[PDB]
Amino acid sequence: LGDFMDKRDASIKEQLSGVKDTSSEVKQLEEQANAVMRAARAEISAALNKMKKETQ
Amino acid sequence: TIRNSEELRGKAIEQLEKARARLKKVEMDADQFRVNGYSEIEREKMNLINSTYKTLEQFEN
Structure with missing residues (x-):
């Protein structure tokens, strides 16, 4: 019975941690996506400027 | 507690x-x-070159 109690409690605590783990993983995913999108935009802008300046 | 970690x-x-x-x-938008x-x-x-060549020719005129 002691083992059963432990198993159930661990299963629940583990579920909470995983749920906590998943939330952090999704926050990281969102941050990475945001950073990547910024790079695209900024990168291209810089490119044109440098390219625009060279053309000029 | 369990329902919280999973949601997170x-x-x-x-x-x-x-x-x-x-x-x-974005990497796409920027790329674009x-x-x-x-x-x-x-x-x-x-634009510049073409128009300045036009200006030249007008000067020649």
């Missing part, structure tokens, strides 16, 4: 993945923007 992890990953997906898309800008700069350079 679910929501969290939905968000990291989403953020990086947005990064990719860079091409457009490059083409515009070439055309603008073309």
Whole structure:
């Protein structure tokens, strides 16, 4: 019975941690996506400027 | 307690993945923007030269 109690409690605590783990993983995913999108935009802008300046 | 961690992890990953997906898309917009800008700069350079050649010819006139 002691083992059963432990198993159930661990299963629940583990579920909470995983749920906590998943939330952090999704926050990281969102941050990475945001950073990547910024790079695209900024990168291209810089490119044109440098390219625009060279053309000029 | 269990329902919380899972939600955090679910929501969290939905968000990291989403953020990086947005990064990719931008990586796309910028990529697009860079091409457009490059083409515009070439055309603008073309503008200058063409018009100044016109100005030359008018000077010759």
